[PDB]
Ligand binder design. Structure first.
Ligand SMILES: Cc1cc(C(=O)NNC(=O)c2ccncc2)ccc1Cl
Lengths: 367, 367
């Protein structure tokens, strides 16, 4: 028999200067446990790589260095735009294989936002705590850890898909025929979850035929809401800025508004503060300001460094990712997202969101 | 050979108290010409019917009374909600057959917004000038008249489709089998226009299999814009209020924003003023206010009674209707809409929109 929740437990980074308290696992302890119990390999994937920025990050980097010295195959995937600290990394860990990934060389827009660890096809972590010192010590982060071998292997498959886009030599990022020969596989999705847990993936041109797009899954879970929608992301402006041009993408925006006005769903949005000079952010703010007073909608803003990307639907579905709900991310960036329906795990996630909502760092929206 | 523009000419109602001037045909003269040249029948369809409110409307009603007395079959279709003045109408014209229409008895939401005349399968008018004294004398209106027999017959087919929904006795508004036996036909659509002119129809459950939905046509013409979008409607709030519940429908709203931000289309919106107590209208206003200053978008408001529903795309497509661009109308109401691509007719429509844009009644948007 399979376990309920797939042996998944919540992990988060709560700095000392912040009032966030919980009995759950910390990202520091999580990475320590992943490295200690490692016997075959440790695969890590994120955007940037700079663990030495804080103390705990340096400690994790030292433990990983010891693991690589003992014979463990360490492979670290980071986007080619986080290539600044690369010369700093290889100088400290010559046995760790660092690989620059460019998942989109057609237009140079897609970015690698894996932000997950997998070890021995037995242990795994997935969240918004990248392999940096801030995401481990000073930046509040959220994610999930599991010692369930099948889930860890299904995440290792995503790591395999992402590794093939290395820049050096012909690979899936250079040749079309070699990229077409990528066994893009998945063992569990929304049509066949394991222990009430599955992985969604992004972007669309990297799914193959089996994997499920995170965009469609999130939009469906938002359109199928009946009771409550609780979102803690950075910002939900329907317009991003790619290069020097504004890009309009209101899919999640309009789905949430459809939930709020037509279906009257109690929605609470905890987002990061915005620049007063950005007219798009101010337009979004004053648009939601007239909707909070008309329908059952609440909005709070935070100013702290928080990478948390949490979605909770009807106290029955939970969705934790490393990408933010916007156009650029769900249209070009490549990432993996944890989705669960286990009532216990969703209840713990609801507890975390309730703690964050009434936190002192969550001031009410004022315009 | 077929004529260019399908013998169509612009018709409009410009009151004396307003500064609108044009050499085009007036709605009063248009109805006079339709009634005078009538030899077989005169079919009229609108929402409400109250011509005696003004002088010119009473004159048109008297001419129609004379036509009915001479033996012309006069049938007037009005929605069952405009049934107040019914006893006033039949008392003055006993020979005119007035019919109450309820196109939606399932939920009692759909309303008859035909707003067109057809005579002898030879002459026809279609616009936003209903069969009322205001739409002929005191309310600025817009529409098109044509003495082209095929176009008039294709509009008479729409009149036939709408007539079958009479309330008294079993008909297309009472029985399902009798409604299924409605020869819902059309001779021209966007895939086979005549002289660069075609009719779009609404709602979706009244199209059959041949007619084209006005919603899809308008959304496609807005998404396929490259140069300019000029809209003169009442309001473009993505939220209406049906009964005592708000209904969110941002399809046209989001298509226009997609045209403005992503494609940078120069868009000028001439809409009617809104209530300061309506939070949805204020939200829409302050949303567009931050977009006019960022992209090439301009907004002006008018306070006069104007039923004009004009859309102009790239100085190549023109769309004149009686319904307003919103959710309730294009989701439940039943109407017919004129669409043309003839460069001469679209140029005249652009002239009319330019005259209205710089008019004194068009004050710049201020918040
Ligand atoms: C491009 C953009 C578009 C919007 C937008 O679409 N605002 N519109 C409403 O918020 C609304 C108004 C009335 N009814 C329902 C919703 C907001 C911000 C931004 Cl940057």
């Amino acid at each position: 028999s399979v376990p309920a929740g797939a042996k998944c437990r919540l992990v988060e980074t709560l700095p000392e200067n912040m009032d966030f308290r919980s009995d759950h696992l910390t990202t520091f302890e999580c990475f320590n446990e992943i490295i200690t119990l490692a016997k075959k390999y440790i695969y890590i994937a994120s955007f940037c790589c700079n663990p030495l920025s804080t103390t705990r990050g340096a400690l994790i980097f030292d433990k990983l260095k010891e693991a690589s010295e003992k014979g463990i195959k360490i492979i670290v995937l980071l986007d080619e735009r986080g290539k600044r600290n690369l010369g700093e990394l290889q100088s400290h860990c010559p046995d760790i294989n660092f690989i620059t990934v460019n998942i989109d060389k057609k237009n140079n827009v897609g970015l690698l936002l894996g932000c997950f660890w997998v070890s021995d096809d037995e242990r795994c972590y997935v969240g918004n705590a990248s392999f940096t010192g801030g995401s481990i010590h000073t930046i509040k982060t959220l994610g999930v850890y599991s010692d369930y071998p099948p889930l860890a292997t299904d995440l290792r498959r995503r790591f395999d898909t992402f590794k093939a886009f290395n820049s050096a030599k012909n690979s899936a990022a250079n040749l079309a025929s070699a990229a077409a020969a990528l066994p893009v596989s998945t063992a569990y999705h929304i049509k066949n979850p394991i222990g009430g847990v599955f992985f969604t993936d992004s972007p669309e041109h990297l799914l193959g035929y089996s994997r499920d797009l995170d965009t469609d899954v999130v939009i469906d879970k938002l359109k199928s809401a009946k009771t409550s929608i609780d979102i803690e992301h950075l910002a939900i402006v329907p317009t991003t800025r790619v290069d020097g041009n504004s890009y309009y993408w209101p899919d999640i925006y309009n789905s949430i508004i459809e939930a709020a006005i037509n279906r009257g769903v109690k929605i609470r949005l905890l987002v990061g503060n915005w620049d007063k000079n950005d007219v798009y952010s101010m337009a979004t703010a004053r648009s939601l300001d007239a909707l909070c007073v008309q329908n059952d909608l609440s909005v709070k803003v935070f100013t702290i460094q928080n990478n948390t990307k949490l979605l909770i639907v009807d106290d029955e579905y939970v969705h934790i990712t490393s990408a933010n709900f916007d156009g650029t991310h769900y249209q070009n960036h490549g990432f993996v997202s944890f989705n669960s329906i286990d009532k216990q795990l969703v209840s713990e996630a609801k507890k975390i969101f309730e703690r964050d909502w009434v936190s002192s760092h969550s001031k009410s929206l004022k315009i």
